[PDB]
Structure formats: C-alpha cells, structure tokens
DNA sequence: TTCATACGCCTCTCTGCTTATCGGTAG
C-alpha cells in the first residue's frame, strides 16, 4: 500500500505519481533483477559466443546510439579510479562521476557499473583468448545495455512482494529479535 | 580494536552518528536477518525501500505515521483509519475508474 | 507554495516580502 | 466526435466525409507541430476503445 | 499482483468491464417530448 | 484484446522463467520427471532404432 | 597521574575535528596544520601550571575560501581564543567583521539564554559542540556534495526542489556544513 | 458572429503549457526500444483498431486472429500508430514505431 | 468506512467479478506448460464477446 | 380484572501520542 505507485521513471530515476525522486538508480546498477543472473557468467558468456551474437543483433544496433563518448568517460574514471583507489573512503575527492550518472545507461555503450568493469577487467586478465577481446567487451556492454530496466515497471511492488512472500517461510524457532 | 566496534542498529546511529547512514543501517540489518536462513532477496530491494529515510528527513515508517505526507489521501483512506483521513481531505485511479500510470499506464498512444 | 518560512522571519524593522516572491514564482 | 478507425493521415478516402456529424479541420500535437499543411498527423486515441473524441476547431 | 506485473488492462478489466460544472447527481428528466436533459439543482 | 495482450505477453508464465527475489528460476520439472531422468541418462541406457525413433517422435511432435 | 591530560586530548581531537570541517567547506588550512601531532600540540601548548591555559590557549580559525570559482560568494569565520570561553555557555560576540558565517564552539553547558540573538543576523549561524571526537570506518556517509551549479540537474530531470530527498537543517552532516535551503 | 472565441482563451491557455513541458524533436533523451509493455499495449490496441473493422495496410495473412494479425504488423512494421511517452513532470517525448526497435 | 470491513477494502480495493470460475486443479504432464485445463462446462458457459469481422 | 399488542431495558497483548509535576531563568 505504501509502494503502490512507485514505478520506474523514462529517465533512470524512480518517481511516484507525483513525480518525487525515491532514487537516481535502481541500486546504482539500473540491471533488472530477472535479466542479470550470467552478467557475470564470463565463461558460459564467451561460449555460444555467436548465438549470443544473433540474439543481441549488433547490426541493427549501430544506427541508433554512439559508444566511443562513453567508453572514453569509462576509460578516463578507471584511470582514476585505479589511480587513487588506495585512499580512504574521506579523502577521496569526485574528479569524474560515474558513467551512468554522465550518460543513459540504456541509450550510450560502456555506460556500466563500477564492480562490472572491476569484475569484467579482472576475468579478461586472464589470457586464454571470435575470441577477439575488443568484440567480447562490446559484446558484454551491448548484454547490459539490454539488461536494464524497462520505463514503467512495477519496482517498489516487486520489492515489496520480494520482502514479503519470502518471509513467510523465514523463521519458525531457534538474544537478538 | 576500539575502533572498530559497533552495535550497529538504527536505535542509536541515526540520531547523531549519520544521517544518509540510514540507506547502509537500515539494508545492513534487513540483510542480516535473511541471512540467518539465506534466502538472500536482492540488494535491489533492500535499497528500493528508501520511503523510509529519503521520503522525507529521517527514518519514516510504512504505518499510518508516515501516510500522512503523502499528497494523494485515497491510498490513507484505503488504508487504516477512513475516518480521520477523510477529514483532513476537507489507488485514486482504482477508486475513480481511471487507467492506471504503470506497464501500459505509464504513458500514452495516439495516432 | 514554496519554502520561504525562514527568509521572512525578521522583516518589521512584514508582509512586504511575499509580494515580490509571487511574482518572482511566475517569473 | 465519433473518430473513424484510420485517422493518422487525411489524404482521400472520405475521412473527413460525414466526419462533422460525430469547415476547417484541427489537429493536436502537444510536441511541437510540423508543417500545418501535411496531409497526415497525429491522432488521440481513447484508452481502451479505438476512439478519439475530445475537441476540434471548425465552423461554418 | 495485476500491477506487479504491471498489465495496467488487465487491472481495469479486472476492477471494471457528471456534473460537470459542480464537479461533485441529478439529470434525465424529459418532460413532453424533448430527450432527456440535466437540471442539477447543485449547478 | 489489450487485456488478452497483457496476458499473453506480459503475463505469460514463460515471461515469467525467473523469480525477483534474487534472480533464480522456479519452473521445471519435479519428481517422476527427475527420477525418469537419472534413469535414462545413465550409461546403462540402450535403445533400438524403433525405441530411440518412437521416443523422439513422441517427445517431440513437430505437426504440433 | 589524574583527568588532566584528557581534557587536554579531547580538546586536541576536537580541534583536528575542526580544522578538517573547516577544510572540507573549503577553507584552506595547512596540512600538517590539520595534523597537528599532540606532542606538538603540548609543546606549543604547555603551562607553567600545567593547567588547560596550556600557557598559549588563544585558538584562531580563520578561513581561506579557495572554492571562489564556483561559489560567487564567501565570507569568513574569526574563532579566537575559544579554549575555554568559560565554565558553562554565556551573547558575548554577537557580530564581528565577518558577513558571511561564524563558529562559536562551546564546552556544551549550553544556555539558553546564550542560544537567543543567533537566528538574527541574516548571514551566520551555529552548531557547535563539545568534542565530536564525522568520518570513520563505521561510517558509511557518502561524501557530500555543495551542488552550487543545480539547475542542470533541475534542468536534465525536469524536477521541482522539493521533490528531492529532503536532508534535514539539524542532521549532523549537514551541519558538518552550513548547508541552507 | 463570432462569440467568446477560443472559450474565454482557454484553448490558447495551457496550450502553451503543453508546448513548453514536451521535449522537441532531436532532443529526446529516450532509450530506443519498444519496451514489453509499450509492445502489449500496441499490440492489444491495433488488434481492437482492426476488429473494429478497420482497414490493414497487410493482406499477407489469411488468418482470423486479431492479435496474430497485430504481431504480424509488429513484424511488418505497418502500424499507423504514435507512442506518448511523457515524463513524470509532463514532458512529452514523442516516439514513433517505424524508428523504433522492437527487440 | 470502517476499520477492516470497511467500503473500501470489500468493495472499492477488490470486487466480485463476472466472467470467472474457480474448482480443483488436477495434474496433467500431456499439456503444454503455458496451456490449461478447460473442462467442457467451462467452455459452453464462459463466453468472449467478440466482433464479426 | 383482564386481554391484545405496541412498546421496552443490563477471564492472559502492545504502540504512539491525550495529557501529567515541577522548577528555572532573565525580565
Ligand atoms: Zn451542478
């Protein structure tokens, strides 16, 4: 009843009926829920690389978007980042945002999460090897690009119900409540 | 190990010891008592439930306490307490018979 | 209509200055 | 006003014939409009019923 | 559940399927042989 | 028909192969069907051109 | 020994606390200034007495207001000498030769008649504390950021200012600043 | 003979308002792609368009099912339809289908 | 108007609906997964209104 | 005095917000 309305905004931020902003992101990552569970299954990803290729039609997707702006963005925050990860969390100052605060996530390529690339850099440094790692990379960021969160969906409902339902089944029995 | 120790629950941290702190108090308690039997519902959720510290100043609740800002009255009335709702006023879309603004609502067609 | 309580909290060296606001607002 | 199924273009087929019934014609596009002389532009639709029936400016 | 899944249709088919001036009735009243018209005593 | 659009397209139980709560599936099938499984995976199983083509085509029926 | 020594810790942290609030507005101070070793500390600070007069307890804050590029405007603060401004709170600087802000700390023994003629300048206010001995491990608060420059985001989200999350005057962080309306 | 034109302005007022809160051509900040629900919704109301007897551009299929028919447009890409896709603020983002991907 | 039985929650946040059937499920492997079963008393009594194209 | 019928009276769970006493200080 309380999160009746709260629905996913065209813009990537989440706004009510009245249009009052609960969160700029759908937890800082903006994937859906459902469309996330092999965004890290790297291996299985790379295999069944040209079905994978088929589903997610590369050709028609050019005519519509542009990527070189925001994969220099990303390329520049990681550059930072990896400068000055080593600072504590209260020195650290903001020199460039993260991407999907710069750009749209669904509309601009490499517009990703912080962790995914962290995670995405770290399985490619790995050697191993088609196998071409300049088509994997655009290959993975057109997979979370497809992986977002339609304009409209029912979040808040959904989370409600996902905090709700399971609890049914939490605790039966055996200091803190 | 002084420093790092905290009894970490919103009886105490929020009034002083942060406020923002409410979106990693509040996710971190939730979690953790999921995590007693693992059934481990996404972060997403956990973050998503924020009317209760952003909606407003600090720590609302999803009672009758924290319907009262809301603008709309038809979702309090519906909920707990018709009567004193209604006499402030002197869901909605459920009430009146008009098409709701989610999934195919949430926006129009023409042409 | 908009939060300007504080602003007009000493004004009688009061009602001077809502009026520029409102215009302020369609302006 | 009773709107026929097909409004989206007004060219031929006596779309606007016995349409004044249910003499200019007007068109509503709150993003803004294109040339007001193109044969075809846009239409509201009602909800659910394929419809659309709010206002329009003529007289005669 | 019907707005969980957010078919907003399939809600109002489910849940479904004026004064215009008072905005708050009364009308249909035909006297002789005229058709039905409105008299809102509140307008 | 827009109700009968949600339904078949967003309401659809294939649509719906994943739960929210935390991304795992909840369709599939159970008990007979697991057993059945294990039994006729296993490298114990043989079958006949007559078996292996009446499996397939009772399996698969592609008129359907 | 006996509670000598931690007054004078407290005191110590709680003017470190300072100087980083002070720095993190955006008033430039020194930073081995900001460190301050409390050897140090007690080296420049050490009575005859060994007392809290320290024999050189005249505390100055004053503030540089680097950040002009993207604030058009900002004032100064003058915090002298406020080592022990007395047992308990006394209205005693009401105004000085700042016309932007202006820090009184006090030792928390507040008085209410001290806490009147504070909502009366238009450009001051005060949040002070006893120690506030922030930042930490345990706490997990973002970093704040004095947006000067919001209507582009106004502008991007096509949004009014109250339909943001709403931090409120008295939350500790946002009194870390003197963040407004 | 002529009277109170434009209803005492009323239709010039707040159409203004329309003009201004909608974001022009060129300028949509909008992800192309027919989300699931704007599919549904299309695909349900073309489908009631064309059982109110209502002309179709495509003769290929010689089915009775209006919603099969509708999908077949989807396919073709001949639906005489526009998506309003306003903002929550009321700024309308106007897509059409034809330069939209449905996948 | 009332506490939990009130007008809102009995007749205007839920309603009895027409064109509807409850009974008993029975399992049946022989149907897809995205079909159902309908018994033929179902099948002469709901009905879809339908235009004549 | 009664009968016919309209009238005719009384024991196992807990929050959050009504409000209490009570004094202390600049005036
Ligand atoms: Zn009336």
Same mark, same amino acid.
Not at chain 7, 34 to 55: H, I, N, T
Not at chain 7, 95 to 103: A, D, S
């Given at each position: 009843?309380?999160?009746?309305?709260?629905?996913?905004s065209?813009?990537?931020?989440?706004?009510?009926?009245?249009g009052?902003?609960?969160?700029?992101?759908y937890?800082?990552?903006?994937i859906?829920i459902?469309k996330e569970?092999?965004?890290?299954?790297?291996?299985?990803?790379?295999?069944?690389?040209?079905?994978?290729?088929?589903?997610?039609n590369?050709?028609?997707?050019?005519?519509?978007?542009?990527?070189?702006?925001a994969?220099?963005y990303?390329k520049?925050?990681?550059?930072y980042?990896?400068?000055?990860?080593?600072?504590?969390?209260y020195?650290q100052?903001?020199?460039?945002?993260?991407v999907?605060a710069?750009?749209?996530?669904?509309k601009?390529?490499?517009?990703?999460?912080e962790?995914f690339?962290d995670?995405?850099?770290?399985?490619?440094?790995?050697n191993s090897?088609?196998?071409?790692?300049?088509?994997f990379?655009?290959?993975?960021?057109?997979?979370?690009?497809?992986?977002?969160?339609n304009?409209?969906?029912?979040?808040?409902?959904i989370?409600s119900?996902?905090?709700?339902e399971?609890?049914t089944?939490?605790?039966?029995n055996?200091?803190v409540? | 190990?002084?420093?790092?120790?905290?009894?970490?629950?919103?009886?105490?941290?929020?009034?002083?010891?942060?406020?923002?702190?409410?979106?990693?108090?509040?996710?971190n308690?939730?979690?953790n008592?999921?995590?007693?039997?693992?059934?481990?519902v996404?972060?997403?959720?956990?973050?998503?439930?924020?009317?209760?510290?952003?909606?407003?100043?600090?720590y609302?609740?999803?009672?009758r306490?924290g319907?009262e800002?809301?603008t709309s009255?038809?979702?309090?009335?519906?909920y707990?307490?018709?009567?004193?709702?209604?006499?402030?006023?002197?869901?909605?879309?459920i009430?009146?018979?008009k098409?709701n603004?989610?999934?195919?609502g949430?926006?129009?067609?023409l042409? | 209509?908009?939060?300007?309580?504080?602003?007009?909290?000493?004004?009688?060296?009061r009602?001077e200055?809502?009026?520029?606001?409102?215009?302020?607002?369609?302006? | 006003?009773?709107?026929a199924?097909?409004?989206?273009?007004?060219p031929?087929?006596?779309?606007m014939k016995?349409?004044?019934?249910?003499e200019?014609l007007?068109?509503?596009?709150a993003?803004?409009?294109?040339?007001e002389?193109?044969?075809?532009?846009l239409?509201?639709?009602?909800?659910?019923?394929?419809?659309?029936?709010?206002?329009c400016?003529v007289?005669? | 559940?019907?707005?969980?899944?957010?078919?907003?249709?399939?809600?109002?088919?489910?849940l479904?399927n004026v004064?215009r001036?008072?905005?708050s009735?009364?009308?249909?009243?035909?006297?002789?042989?005229?058709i039905?018209?409105v008299?809102?005593?509140?307008c | 028909?827009?109700?009968?659009?949600?339904?078949?397209?967003?309401?659809?139980t294939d649509?719906?192969?994943?739960?929210?709560?935390?991304?795992?599936?909840?369709?599939?099938?159970?008990?007979?069907?697991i057993?059945?499984?294990?039994?006729?995976?296993?490298?114990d199983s043989?079958?006949?051109?007559?078996?292996?083509?009446?499996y397939?085509?009772?399996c698969?029926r592609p008129?359907? | 020994?006996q509670?000598?020594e931690?007054?004078i810790?407290?005191?110590?942290?709680?003017?470190?606390?300072?100087?980083?609030?002070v720095?993190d507005?955006?008033?430039?101070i020194?930073?081995?200034?900001?460190?301050?070793?409390l050897?140090?500390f007690?080296?420049?600070?050490?009575?005859?007495?060994?007392?809290?007069?320290?024999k050189?307890?005249?505390?100055?804050?004053?503030?540089?207001?680097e950040?002009?590029?993207?604030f !058009?405007?900002?004032?100064?603060?003058?915090?002298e000498?406020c080592?022990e401004?007395?047992?308990g709170?006394?209205?005693?600087?009401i105004?000085?030769?700042?016309?932007?802000?202006?820090?009184?700390?006090?030792?928390?023994?507040?008085?209410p008649?001290?806490?009147?003629?504070?909502?009366?300048?238009?450009?001051?206010?005060?949040?002070?504390?006893?120690?506030?001995?922030?930042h930490?491990?345990?706490?997990?608060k973002?970093?704040?950021?004095?947006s000067d420059?919001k209507?582009?985001?106004?502008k991007?989200?096509r949004?009014?200012?109250?339909q943001?999350?709403?931090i409120?005057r008295?939350? !500790?962080?946002?009194?870390?600043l003197?963040?407004?309306? | 003979?002529?009277g109170?034109?434009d209803?005492?302005?009323?239709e010039?007022?707040?159409?203004?308002?329309?003009?201004?809160?909608?974001?022009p051509?060129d300028?949509?900040?909008?992800?192309?792609?027919?989300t699931?629900?704007?599919?549904?919704?299309?695909?349900?109301?073309?489908?009631?368009?064309?059982?109110?007897?209502?002309?179709?551009?495509?003769?290929?299929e010689?089915?009775?099912?209006?919603?099969?028919?509708?999908?077949?447009?989807?396919?073709?890409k001949?639906?005489?339809?526009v998506i309003?896709?306003?903002?929550p603020?009321?700024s309308?983002?106007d897509?059409?289908?034809?330069?939209?991907?449905?996948d | 108007?009332?506490?939990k039985?009130?007008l809102?929650?009995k007749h205007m946040m839920?309603?009895?609906?027409?064109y509807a059937?409850?009974?008993?499920?029975?399992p049946?492997?022989?149907?897809?997964?995205?079909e159902?079963?309908?018994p033929?008393?179902?099948?002469?009594?709901?009905?879809? !209104?339908?235009?004549?194209?």
């Amino acid at each position: 009843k309380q999160l009746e309305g709260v629905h996913v905004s065209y813009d990537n931020s989440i706004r009510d009926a009245d249009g009052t902003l609960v969160q700029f992101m759908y937890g800082g990552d903006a994937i859906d829920i459902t469309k996330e569970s092999h965004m890290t299954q790297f291996e299985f990803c790379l295999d069944n690389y040209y079905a994978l290729l088929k589903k997610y039609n590369p050709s028609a997707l050019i005519e519509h978007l542009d990527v070189e702006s925001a994969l220099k963005y990303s390329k520049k925050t990681l550059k930072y980042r990896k400068k000055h990860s080593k600072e504590p969390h209260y020195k650290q100052s903001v020199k460039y945002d993260p991407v999907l605060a710069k750009y749209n996530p669904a509309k601009y390529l490499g517009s990703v999460s912080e962790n995914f690339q962290d995670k995405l850099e770290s399985f490619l440094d790995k050697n191993s090897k088609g196998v071409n790692e300049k088509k994997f990379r655009a290959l993975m960021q057109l997979k979370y690009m497809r992986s977002l969160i339609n304009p409209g969906e029912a979040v808040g409902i959904i989370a409600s119900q996902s905090v709700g339902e399971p609890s049914t089944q939490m605790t039966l029995n055996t200091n803190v409540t | 190990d002084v420093d790092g120790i905290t009894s970490n629950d919103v009886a105490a941290v929020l009034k002083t010891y942060g406020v923002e702190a409410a979106r990693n108090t509040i996710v971190n308690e939730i979690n953790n008592v999921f995590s007693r039997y693992a059934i481990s519902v996404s972060f997403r959720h956990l973050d998503l439930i924020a009317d209760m510290m952003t909606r407003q100043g600090t720590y609302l609740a999803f009672n009758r306490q924290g319907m009262e800002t809301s603008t709309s009255s038809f979702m309090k009335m519906s909920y707990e307490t018709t009567c004193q709702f209604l006499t402030k006023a002197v869901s909605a879309r459920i009430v009146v018979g008009k098409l709701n603004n989610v999934g195919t609502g949430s926006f129009d067609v023409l042409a | 209509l908009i939060d300007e309580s504080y602003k007009l909290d000493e004004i009688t060296l009061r009602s001077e200055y809502v009026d520029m606001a409102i215009a302020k607002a369609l302006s | 006003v009773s709107l026929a199924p097909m409004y989206l273009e007004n060219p031929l087929q006596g779309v606007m014939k016995q349409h004044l019934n249910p003499e200019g014609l007007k068109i509503l596009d709150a993003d803004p409009l294109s040339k007001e002389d193109t044969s075809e532009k846009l239409i509201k639709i009602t909800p659910d019923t394929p419809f659309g029936f709010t206002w329009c400016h003529v007289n005669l | 559940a019907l707005i969980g899944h957010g078919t907003s249709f399939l809600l109002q088919d489910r849940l479904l399927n004026v004064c215009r001036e008072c905005g708050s009735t009364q009308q249909s009243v035909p006297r002789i042989g005229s058709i039905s018209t409105v008299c809102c005593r509140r307008c | 028909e827009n109700a009968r659009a949600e339904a078949l397209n967003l309401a659809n139980t294939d649509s719906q192969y994943l739960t929210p709560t935390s991304g795992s599936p909840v369709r599939g099938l159970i008990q007979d069907h697991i057993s059945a499984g294990v039994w006729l995976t296993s490298k114990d199983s043989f079958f006949t051109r007559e078996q292996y083509q009446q499996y397939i085509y009772g399996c698969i029926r592609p008129e359907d | 020994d006996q509670e000598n020594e931690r007054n004078i810790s407290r005191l110590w942290r709680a003017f470190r606390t300072v100087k980083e609030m002070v720095k993190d507005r955006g008033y430039f101070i020194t930073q081995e200034e900001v460190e301050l070793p409390l050897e140090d500390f007690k080296a420049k600070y050490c009575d005859s007495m060994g007392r809290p007069q320290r024999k050189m307890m005249s505390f100055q804050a004053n503030p540089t207001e680097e950040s002009i590029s993207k604030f !058009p405007d900002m004032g100064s603060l003058w915090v002298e000498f406020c080592d022990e401004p007395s047992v308990g709170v006394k209205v005693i600087h009401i105004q000085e030769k700042n016309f932007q802000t202006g820090i009184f700390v006090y030792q928390n023994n507040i008085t209410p008649s001290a806490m009147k003629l504070v909502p009366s300048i238009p450009p001051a206010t005060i949040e002070t504390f006893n120690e506030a001995a922030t930042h930490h491990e345990l706490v997990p608060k973002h970093i704040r950021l004095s947006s000067d420059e919001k209507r582009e985001l106004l502008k991007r989200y096509r949004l009014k200012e109250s339909q943001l999350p709403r931090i409120q005057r008295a939350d !500790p962080v946002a009194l870390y600043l003197g963040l407004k309306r | 003979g002529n009277g109170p034109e434009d209803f005492q302005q009323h239709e010039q007022i707040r159409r203004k308002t329309l003009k201004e809160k909608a974001i022009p051509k060129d300028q949509r900040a909008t992800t192309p792609y027919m989300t699931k629900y704007e599919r549904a919704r299309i695909l349900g109301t073309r489908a009631l368009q064309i059982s109110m007897n209502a002309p179709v551009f495509v003769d290929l299929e010689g089915e009775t099912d209006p919603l099969r028919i509708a999908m077949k447009e989807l396919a073709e890409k001949k639906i005489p339809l526009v998506i309003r896709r306003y903002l929550p603020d009321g700024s309308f983002e106007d897509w059409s289908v034809e330069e939209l991907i449905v996948d | 108007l009332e506490k939990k039985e009130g007008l809102f929650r009995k007749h205007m946040m839920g309603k009895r609906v027409n064109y509807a059937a409850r009974s008993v499920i029975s399992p049946d492997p022989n149907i897809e997964t995205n079909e159902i079963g309908v018994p033929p008393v179902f099948a002469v009594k709901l009905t879809y !209104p339908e235009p004549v194209t």
